[PDB]
Amino acid sequence: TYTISIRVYQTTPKGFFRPVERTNWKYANGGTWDEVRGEYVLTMGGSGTSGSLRFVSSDTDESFVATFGVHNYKRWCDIVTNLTNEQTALVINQEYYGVPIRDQARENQLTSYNVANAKGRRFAIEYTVTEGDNLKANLIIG
Amino acid sequence: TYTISIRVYQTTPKGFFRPVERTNWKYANGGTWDEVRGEYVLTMGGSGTSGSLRFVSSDTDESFVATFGVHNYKRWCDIVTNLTNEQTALVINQEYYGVPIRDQARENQLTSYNVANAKGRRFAIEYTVTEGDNLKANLIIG
Amino acid sequence: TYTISIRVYQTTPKGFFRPVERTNWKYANGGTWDEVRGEYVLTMGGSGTSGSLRFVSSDTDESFVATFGVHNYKRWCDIVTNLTNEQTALVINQEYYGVPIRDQARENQLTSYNVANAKGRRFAIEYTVTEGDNLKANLIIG
Amino acid sequence: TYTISIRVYQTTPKGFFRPVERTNWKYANGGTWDEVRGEYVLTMGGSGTSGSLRFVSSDTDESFVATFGVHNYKRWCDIVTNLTNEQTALVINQEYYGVPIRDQARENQLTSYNVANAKGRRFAIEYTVTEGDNLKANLIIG
Ligand SMILES: [C]C(=O)[N][C]1[C](O[C]2O[C]([C][O])[C]([O])[C]([O])[C]2[O])[C]([O])[C]([C][O])O2[C]1O2[C][C]([N])C([O])=O
């Protein structure tokens, strides 16, 4: 069993991102999302799957999907923003198992990733515990 | 804009179903899930999309996916249980736009549905508000 | 350290009780409330304190407070309903350390308790794990 | 009826503050706490009462209580930190109706307030809507 525990940080009172969606990819017997002590906890049965969280700021017409998983026994993460209305977490999560650019992001097995949207706001994932079954990450909204 | 506000009722202290997943299908400009006053609220850009909630009772090895949406300007609902490990809400939600028996449940535009798992536990959805932009449903776990 | 983990069951689709308040008494170095995998978890520093949860059904103008704690190394529980508007969980929780009938309920160290409100609705607390540091209870709304 | 809707911003990936308590003072027909679209909403029957939230960062031994209310038809707010183990939100909330320095903080009817703990971390409340029945505020953890 792997877990990925996620702490969400929102660094500026400009806009407000709320949680709107959480998905589980079907590989390795799937997975679950849990709220545990104010954290998002992704539990997976083995290596080779993932889960996504979508956040939306309606004040500023902004959004992003953050995906976390384990690929060949190492954690990975990715952020996708500049989402169309058709790009829900359900769509984005699935794409990490067929779309080349998404595949590569997952294949990179990164301990940290950051990206800016069209408005120049940065989003980041940083794993604070990068090894073992029980992984920890910060999700940082700039 | 459509909303569907869901009240969850767990009726018997045998096992414990917890929320593990919430998805949004991509049609009609997507949609979102919100927690509002102890209720799950699905917001949708217009007619023709849906969202799924998955619940798991790990005590008793039981689970189900409940799906809610609007089809041709009327509400619909369905429950799927006896899930394989591969059947997350991500997977199930999509099947309502291609798989014939799932297509049928959507086309049925039901105000009320119920089914049972192989263990004999019943799951039900009853809309209490069936018309208009702001719909309401009970999700009853037996 | 004691923990009491609480599963809430709402048994009838008549009215809807939503969580509105969660308090901690000051004795034994206090304590915290956490949400953990869909359950309410009361964590306390040692024996001799407690915490309260209030639920409101504004549809039917019903409310109650359920209090959980440890007194002389045994778990206890109680429910107060037919609440005035001035009887928040903040108020009720404190009454268990000065008000004689509340004191008595705490001193009973019950593994289960049930009571009916003005409208004949039954509320129940039933501990499923009655011994040790990590206690479990069902909160059942009839 | 007054509402105060609160958006929480945790700005710094050092330590993690989780919600552990939410209370309602008994005056003016009391009040309730709701989770609404990822925000904390305090509802109160009229002017002259309040509610408190407590947040704890176990990793760094930090905590605080943030209190919001309406005093003589104008909003107020306060933060207390450097807490003892006996100072739960239950205790702090009610000190605003008896303890002079706390009474004064409330009598100030502030639209913004900030204070630091002994470790130098700033906490802040910033009302973004300051007038009328439905007030809005940012809670910023530095
Ligand atoms: C070990 C790992 O991680 N692997 C991976 C995978 O996962 C998998 O899947 C399968 C189906 O296919 C099953 O489910 C199992 O259980 C799991 O584990 C996948 O995910 C992939 C992506 O696609 O990746 C990885 O691997 C690699 C190899 N080479 C293959 O391809 O298989």
Ligand SMILES: [C]C(=O)[N][C]1[C](O[C]2O[C]([C][O])[C]([O])[C]([O])[C]2[O])[C]([O])[C]([C][O])O2[C]1O2[C][C]([N])C([O])=O
């Ligand atoms: C009106 C309605 O409801 N419709 C529907 C639909 O939805 C749609 O989709 C599209 C794509 O394709 C888009 O997205 C839009 O926006 C929406 O709205 C669909 O869903 C279907 C299912 O498949 O169903 C319904 O319909 C039928 C017909 N075609 C019509 O349209 O009417």
Ligand SMILES: [C]C(=O)[N][C]1[C](O[C]2O[C]([C][O])[C]([O])[C]([O])[C]2[O])[C]([O])[C]([C][O])O2[C]1O2[C][C]([N])C([O])=O
């Ligand atoms: C051990 C026990 O449980 N005890 C109890 C108590 O608690 C206490 O408190 C105190 C203050 O005062 C402190 O905080 C400590 O820490 C604790 O532990 C109390 O609560 C009481 C009630 O009031 O009860 C019990 O007890 C015993 C005797 N009997 C007396 O009373 O004291």
Ligand SMILES: [C]C(=O)[N][C]1[C](O[C]2O[C]([C][O])[C]([O])[C]([O])[C]2[O])[C]([O])[C]([C][O])O2[C]1O2[C][C]([N])C([O])=O
């Ligand atoms: C209007 C206002 O805000 N006022 C106030 C108050 O509140 C009140 O309280 C009472 C009892 O006593 C009752 O509950 C009612 O309902 C309410 O409204 C209080 O809070 C106070 C503080 O302590 O403050 C205010 O005021 C002033 C003086 N004290 C008088 O006026 O009385």
Ligand SMILES: CC(=O)N[C@@H]1[C@@H](O)[C@H](O)[C@@H](CO)O[C@@H]1O
């Ligand atoms: C700005 C943006 O969202 N770009 C994303 C990038 O972050 C992600 O790594 C890549 C692979 O999924 O797909 C997009 O190009």
Ligand SMILES: CC(=O)N[C@@H]1[C@@H](O)[C@H](O)[C@@H](CO)O[C@@H]1O
């Ligand atoms: C036992 C079970 O899960 N049955 C489901 C049924 O409830 C649902 O209406 C149908 C269409 O999606 O798919 C399955 O037959």
Ligand SMILES: CC(=O)N[C@@H]1[C@@H](O)[C@H](O)[C@@H](CO)O[C@@H]1O
């Ligand atoms: C109907 C009702 O709520 N009665 C309660 C009772 O359940 C509780 O055990 C006792 C001590 O606190 O007093 C209260 O009034």
Ligand SMILES: CC(=O)N[C@@H]1[C@@H](O)[C@H](O)[C@@H](CO)O[C@@H]1O
């Ligand atoms: C560091 C600290 O917690 N100081 C608080 C202050 O913020 C508050 O305004 C006052 C009134 O309650 O009580 C204390 O002095």
